Amino acid sequence: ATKFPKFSQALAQDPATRRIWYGIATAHDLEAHDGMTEENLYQKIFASHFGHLAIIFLWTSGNLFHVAWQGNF
Amino acid sequence: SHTVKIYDTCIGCTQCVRACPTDVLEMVPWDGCKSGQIASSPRVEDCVGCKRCETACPTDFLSVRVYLGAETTRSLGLAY
Amino acid sequence: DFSGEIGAANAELGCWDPLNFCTDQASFDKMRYAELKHGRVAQLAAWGYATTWSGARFPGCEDFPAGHEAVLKIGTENLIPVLVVAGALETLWKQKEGSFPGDFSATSFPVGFGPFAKTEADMIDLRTKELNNGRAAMMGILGMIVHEQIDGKPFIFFDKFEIYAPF
Amino acid sequence: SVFDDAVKDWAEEYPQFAAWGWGPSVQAEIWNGRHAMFGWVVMCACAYAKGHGLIPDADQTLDLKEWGTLATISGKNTITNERAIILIANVHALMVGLAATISPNSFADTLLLDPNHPMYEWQMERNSKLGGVMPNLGKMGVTPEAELANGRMAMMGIITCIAYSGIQGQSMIDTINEWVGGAYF
Amino acid sequence: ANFIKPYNDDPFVGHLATPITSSSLTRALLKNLPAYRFGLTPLLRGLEIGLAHGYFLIGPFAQLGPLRNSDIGLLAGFLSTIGLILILTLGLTIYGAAAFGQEKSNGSELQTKKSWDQFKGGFFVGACGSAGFAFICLSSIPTFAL
Amino acid sequence: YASELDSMTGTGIESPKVFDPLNLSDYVPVDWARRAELSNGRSAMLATVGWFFPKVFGTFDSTDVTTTDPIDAIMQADPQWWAQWILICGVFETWKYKKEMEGKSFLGGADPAVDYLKLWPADAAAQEEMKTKELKNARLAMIGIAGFAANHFIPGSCPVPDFIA
Amino acid sequence: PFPTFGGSTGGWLRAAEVEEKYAITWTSTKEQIFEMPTGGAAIMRNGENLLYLARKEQCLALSTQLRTFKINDYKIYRIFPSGEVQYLHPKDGVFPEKVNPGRTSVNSRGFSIGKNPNPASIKFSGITTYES
Amino acid sequence: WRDEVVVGITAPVGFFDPLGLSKGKDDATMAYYREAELKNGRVAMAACLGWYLNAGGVHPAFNSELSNDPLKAMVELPAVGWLQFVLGCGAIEWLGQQIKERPGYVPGDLLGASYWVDNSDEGWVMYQNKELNNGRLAMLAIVGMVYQDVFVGDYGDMMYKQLV
Amino acid sequence: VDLDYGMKNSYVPATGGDGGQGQFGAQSPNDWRVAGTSPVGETSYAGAADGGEEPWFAEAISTVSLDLQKADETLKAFTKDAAAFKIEEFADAAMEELVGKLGYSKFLEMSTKQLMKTWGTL
Amino acid sequence: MAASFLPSILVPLVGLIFPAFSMALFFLYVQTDDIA
Ligand code: CLA
Ligand code: CLA
Ligand SMILES: CC(=O)O[C@H]1CC(C)(C)C(=C=C/C(C)=C/C=C/C(C)=C/C=C/C=C(C)/C=C/C=C(\C)C(=O)C[C@@]23O[C@]2(C)C[C@@H](O)CC3(C)C)[C@](C)(O)C1
Ligand SMILES: CC(=O)O[C@H]1CC(C)(C)C(=C=C/C(C)=C/C=C/C(C)=C/C=C/C=C(C)/C=C/C=C(\C)C(=O)C[C@@]23O[C@]2(C)C[C@@H](O)CC3(C)C)[C@](C)(O)C1
Ligand code: KC1
């Protein structure tokens, strides 16, 4: 938890390039992270869901903008 | 470091200890079986996780179990 | 006299004498006197050859050939005064006894290290430059003459020097 | 004040960047003010050179077969000569700035506050001294206080020029010209 | 009789002294390169290395880049070389940050943060200046005819 | 201004006390500032001579540069010349570095980095006189090259004799 | 007391200098060729032999090979860069495959492998089923 | 120096200095002489091989346009090629001088073979002798071939072509 | 010589899926992440060997050795508890009799009754 | 200034500058020894 990934002591102490790869691949498995509680798990998921919905609306707004600006609608 | 556990079905055949390439295991006195000895893993810091010990174990199911965990230089078998 | 003198090839080779012409100090002193004299004459010779050959004449002699042809075409009456002047000079330079060969500071008219040198290192450096330019100019006049008598361009990449003189 | 609380909270939210002097720091204020002043010089030069037509073939576009696709704006329509020329002048200035950022000398005011640079302590002292709403009229001439004040004035002028040009529905060059009493065009 | 022996008379180190690793040519060359040469300031090591690299880096861009057949091909090659030098300088900067940390360096050895910053700056200047020098040299190529 | 300026060469009679009205010596250290003053001044001495030398005394016998304009000669000169000029300046800078590493000085110290005419005396006061003369002529030449350039770009800004303007 | 070996590229690397190194010593009763685990053949000396290796597994492979020579006195140490040594093998002077009084059992679980608890029963505790 | 050197002394003539050009020369001077003998010999060996290749017609560079006569191809080669040749040899020579400053340097030993073997070994002395003798022969051969090409006009083989 | 020198590392064992530091420590107490090679006259890291005129191969020079005396002494130090156990079960002077009569390694290897047999001789 | 200029302005910023700085920042973050 002193190096990346801070959510996994076991990975943060690996001295190989593996530490990087696994960190990236385990970032969204919030149940397995060090010190996770159930309440914090639900709260972090809620916030991540807001982020995902923001991404969706940005994508739709971008489709609309590019058609309006550069399309032949 | 990997985790190595000995369960009480061990018959003290010493085969896992002879199989270990990094000397993780040793035989210790015990009254639970006829042979009067059980396997032990006092040096799990040197376990590479090859599972030769499990291949050598004659019980059903295994009496020695290696659970792979946090990797170190020693457990990754690195000469560098 | 050896590698501690002026003109040694380098520290490792020292006094470079493949033909063993320098054995004692007397032979080396005579050889160094001859070498310094030849180098001074050859510096003057290369200067004059390059000057006249590049189309430059003194008032009175605007028709004479430049190179060694100036020793076949110029009459004896113009060559002789060089001998007279050189003889007057040969009787004039006087070597200071106790100094290096070619040290003519005992000459009647004042000669020596003037404001040019103050320290011993300065005099040694100046002497080494005089000697090195003398050796280079010996080679240079020899090469000029050979290349003129071979193909006519004493300077092998160009014919005449086009001097820049602002004044 | 709101200023101290604001800077402190920003540093607490972005500590890695706040370490180097990034963000709402005195260092960033100084550097951005220096750039704003130089840019006022450049913008005035551009206005003057457009008013007097000193840029060759300003409305002509660059040759596609000469500069390639990088010089295109849309399809095969290429950037004008004037825009390319202005870009190149600013590129001269940017190359100077990159040389200064990457290879500062020991007595130089570096872009970022590097603890290993020999000017770090002097920079921290100076940056601690500067601060406040009114420029220090006690300190004048070539001083950090005057430099900070003039950088602030230049950034304010840039903001006001953009806003005034927007309100009037005109170009920034037009505003620059009409603010010097039509001295350029 | 035997031109291979263990490096440093140590049979168990993973290296061998061969003519490639231990010839007089190899040793003289490597000890004289600015990355190793005794007595250089880190800035001067960086400067010499940049001068060496920027000069040759312009060639591939000038002679083989997209605009090689335009009459501004040399200028485009120089710009490409400058861009490559910027990429490399970013590499050097983040390398130094990772390898040495951000604490104040306690020494003047090249393998320290302050010295590495000096070396990186020297490299950037040397490389950009060398690319410019090569641009000048390529602007007029001498035929060498009297 | 800085304290070390008191023990430095550069004050004279036209300015017997340290002249630093802007206090620029709090920013540029004195060793760097003096090295740069001498570098710029020596370059300016050469520049002041070369500004007019070909116009007054004639160019060499080449057609590479037809004009005598100091500024318009830059782009007319062949780039091979400019590359070799940069090279020779780099050789000079390398010589300066190597000489200073050898315990020699190009800043009026004891053993000159470059003295080919053997004019550096062994007396501290005589050396002080020579250093003062070099610095005075350096400042004068910097002023002169600046003035020539200003009068060239902006006629009348500096009283330059029209034949060497 | 190094065996007769001409060297190889398979030996130790910077880690042996900065992280850790291993040494194996043994006594041979004659000069005999053996296989280096790092590649190639070396000649044991009559008497004491010392060999440096990058990994403990290399030392143990060499010891396994020494057993085929009837050599059982080999000792294996770990050496740190500061020069501190750890005596590693055989840890108590007795081979681990031979039961020895004074050894305590480590990592035993007093049940068969099928009695470990269910994962869903220890969620968010930070433990695994095999450690609880 | 004569009671120390063994390389170069070989059969027929043994030690061969009839002119006495080695008597009374210091160790530095004789080291210079050996280094020069080796360098001239090596350059002459390379020159002989290159001349033979060119004369035979195997000169495929520049679309094989250059003349088969090596002394003509010398002048048909542009200036820049000779500049590169001279400067590259100069860089090598600079490195060789750096090597020469090193202690225990054996004259002519750029490779630094002294790190592995010395003249107490018979085969190494023998191979050094092979190099030296072939160098001497190649020096004579390059001079002779240049003579035969300049004054006799023929740039090829005049000794063994007459056999076959 | 400290016996826990290996254990005094910076490895912080995780709460799950981690066997921790065993009998000697999970990892070396020395940070392996050190600098690359360095110019002539300089050292890359604290205890690095000076590669002399060849610093590029400086890492091929060994500064870590095992001299036989250190080997014997650490053998005795690391097995002091096992020898203490063997004398505790066989039964100060007696241990000095046994370990000089037959050896220290042999004393470790023998059995308490066998040592009771060799103690019969004097 | 016109919006039609934006691609030739923005595309090099999105496709060259932004990935380079993002990759440098991630590299620095993964090489940091004490992040919290
Ligand atoms: C891998 C094989 C390969 C090769 C040889 C090339 C070659 C080229 N590409 Mg292509 N390309 C490739 C694959 C390749 N490409 C791939 C996989 C893609 C993506 C699909 C592209 C997409 C692409 C585009 C979009 C463009 C090119 C272009 C080019 C040209 C200019 C590139 C340039 O200037 O780089 C610069 C090169 C360097 C800075 C260094 C080169 C390596 C040096 C010389 C090695 C030196 C080592 C030395 C000998 C070692 C010892 C030295 C001594 C110290 C001992 C060049 C002909 C450009 C072009 O216009 O083509 C005409 C262009 O616009 N390429
Ligand atoms: C500021 C320095 C400087 C620069 C950048 C130039 C640049 C130029 N000169 Mg000019 N010139 C200069 C000074 C300079 N000059 C000086 C001092 C003189 C009098 C000697 C001249 C006389 C001159 C003439 C007659 C001509 C030029 C011409 C030119 C152009 C072609 C290059 C050339 O052949 O010049 C030659 C330049 C020199 C011979 C300069 C002298 C070399 C330096 C000063 C020697 C210093 C070394 C010193 C003793 C030791 C260093 C000490 C230590 C630092 C190591 C080019 C634009 C040509 C042109 O096209 O004009 C239209 C041309 O025909 N120059
Ligand atoms: C009253 C009083 O105090 O008087 C004092 C005043 C003063 C002035 C201070 C003093 C002085 C010094 C003096 C007199 C200095 C004069 C020096 C002089 C006259 C020096 C010639 C050099 C030629 C060389 C080195 C070689 C050339 C040529 C070479 C190497 C060639 O290959 C020739 C060449 O043609 C070819 C063959 C091939 C071409 O491809 C190349 C060139 C073209 C080059 C004195 C002595 O103190 C006396
Ligand atoms: C109307 C009014 O108000 O005023 C007018 C007046 C005027 C004049 C018209 C105007 C002007 C222009 C100005 C002020 C021009 C000033 C020019 C100036 C001061 C020019 C110095 C050159 C130094 C050189 C060439 C040194 C070479 C020295 C060299 C190459 C060396 O080797 C150096 C040396 O030390 C060593 C290294 C080694 C020694 O062994 C040898 C020596 C000693 C040689 C203005 C601006 O219009 C104003
Ligand atoms: C003893 C060492 C030796 C050398 C160093 C040498 C060198 C050269 N030989 Mg000679 N040569 C032999 C020996 C040697 N040759 C032998 C034993 C025979 C009988 C088979 C023989 C016969 C021919 C024929 C028929 C020709 C010939 C040539 C060349 C020429 C081109 C070299 C190449 O490129 O392969 C170089 C100077 C050709 C020639 O002179 O062209 C104008 C040519 O036509 N050779």
Ligand code: KC1
């Ligand atoms: C540093 C890297 C390097 C490059 C990139 C390079 C490139 C070229 N070399 Mg060079 N070369 C060296 C290194 C390099 N060479 C070195 C260290 C030496 C001294 C041992 C050396 C010697 C010669 C000689 C004798 C010739 C020569 C040539 C060419 C030419 C061919 C194309 C052409 O010019 O048509 C191309 C551009 C020939 C030539 O230029 O003929 C007019 C020629 O004859 N080289």
Ligand SMILES: CC1=C(C#C/C(C)=C/C=C/C(C)=C/C=C/C=C(C)/C=C/C=C(C)/C=C/[C@@]23O[C@]2(C)C[C@@H](O)CC3(C)C)C(C)(C)C[C@H](O)C1
């Ligand atoms: C008070 C505080 C609040 C705050 C606030 C508010 C309004 C803050 C205001 C922020 C706003 C007003 C800051 C503008 C700066 C102007 C920029 C830097 C100008 C750059 C100009 C320079 C960089 C550029 C110059 C060029 O471009 C030019 C000119 C020409 C080119 O040829 C050349 C160059 C590239 C050099 C919070 C934070 C909301 C909450 C907190 O609690 C309380």
Ligand code: SF4
């Ligand atoms: S997994 Fe391999 S190394 Fe670990 S105890 Fe079992 S046999 Fe030994």
Ligand code: SF4
């Ligand atoms: S764990 Fe298995 S192999 Fe090991 S002693 Fe027990 S029964 Fe035998």
